Amino acid sequence: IEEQAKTFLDKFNHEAEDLFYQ
């Protein structure tokens, strides 16, 4: 699978700027 390894970092790079507020 690539969704849980290739794009699994898309959340750590995105959510990192979204959760930085909450």
Curated annotation (Swiss-Prot):
How this chain assembles, per its entry, is: Homodimer. Interacts with the catalytically active form of TMPRSS2. Interacts with SLC6A19; this interaction is essential for expression and function of SLC6A19 in intestine. Interacts with ITGA5:ITGB1. Interacts (via PDZ-binding motif) with NHERF1 (via PDZ domains); the interaction may enhance ACE2 membrane residence.
Describe the PTM: Proteolytic cleavage by ADAM17 generates a secreted form. Also cleaved by serine proteases: TMPRSS2, TMPRSS11D and HPN/TMPRSS1.
Protein name, entry field: Angiotensin-converting enzyme 2
The organism's superkingdom is given as Eukaryota
Per the entry's comment, what about the domains? The extracellular region of the ACE2 enzyme is composed of two domains. The first is a zinc metallopeptidase domain (residues 19-611). The second domain is located at the C-terminus (residues 612-740) and is 48% identical to human collectrin. The cytoplasmic tail contains several linear motifs such as LIR, PDZ-binding, PTB and endocytic sorting signal motifs that would allow interaction with proteins that mediate endocytic trafficking and autophagy.
Q: What is the lineage of its organism?
A: Eukaryota, Metazoa, Chordata, Craniata, Vertebrata
Q: Which residues of the full protein are shown?
A: 21 to 42 of 805
Function of the molecule: Essential counter-regulatory carboxypeptidase of the renin-angiotensin hormone system that is a critical regulator of blood volume, systemic vascular resistance, and thus cardiovascular homeostasis. Converts angiotensin I to angiotensin 1-9, a nine-amino acid peptide with anti-hypertrophic effects in cardiomyocytes, and angiotensin II to angiotensin 1-7, which then acts as a beneficial vasodilator and anti-proliferation agent, counterbalancing the actions of the vasoconstrictor angiotensin II. (Microbial infection) Acts as a receptor for human coronaviruses SARS-CoV and SARS-CoV-2, as well as human coronavirus NL63/HCoV-NL63.
Family under the similarity heading: Belongs to the peptidase M2 family.
Q: Where in the cell is it found?
A: Cell membrane; Cytoplasm; Cell projection, Cilium; Apical cell membrane
Effect upon mutating residue 19 to R: Increases slightly the interaction with RBD domain of SARS-CoV-2 spike protein
Organism, as annotated: Homo sapiens
Describe the effect of residue 7 to Y: Increases slightly the interaction with RBD domain of SARS-CoV-2 spike protein. In sACE2.v2.2; increases interaction with RBD domain of SARS-CoV-2 spike protein
Query: Which tissues carry this protein?
Result: Expressed in endothelial cells from small and large arteries, and in arterial smooth muscle cells (at protein level). Expressed in enterocytes of the small intestine, Leydig cells and Sertoli cells (at protein level). Expressed in the renal proximal tubule and the small intestine (at protein level). Expressed in heart, kidney, testis, and gastrointestinal system (at protein level). In lung, expressed at low levels in some alveolar type 2 cells, the expression seems to be individual-specific (at protein level). Expressed in nasal epithelial cells (at protein level).
Q: Where is this region: Interaction with SARS-CoV spike glycoprotein?
A: 10-21
What applied role does this protein play in biotech? An engeneered stable, dimeric and secreted receptor with combined mutations that increase the affinity for human coronavirus SARS-CoV-2 spike protein shows potent SARS-CoV and SARS-CoV-2 neutralization in vitro.
**What triggers or suppresses the expression of this protein?**
Up-regulated in failing heart. Expression is induced by IFNA and IFNG. Exposure to cigarette smoke increases expression in lungs. Expression is decreased in nasal and bronchial epithelium of individuals with allergy after allergen challenge. IL13 stimulation decreases expression in nasal and bronchial epithelium.
Name of the gene encoding the protein in the UniProt record: ACE2
Which effect does the record note for changing residue 9 to F? Increases slightly the interaction with RBD domain of SARS-CoV-2 spike protein
So what does mutating residue 17 to A actually do?
No effect on interaction with SARS-CoV spike glycoprotein
Look up what happens after changing residue 20 to D.
Increases slightly the interaction with RBD domain of SARS-CoV-2 spike protein
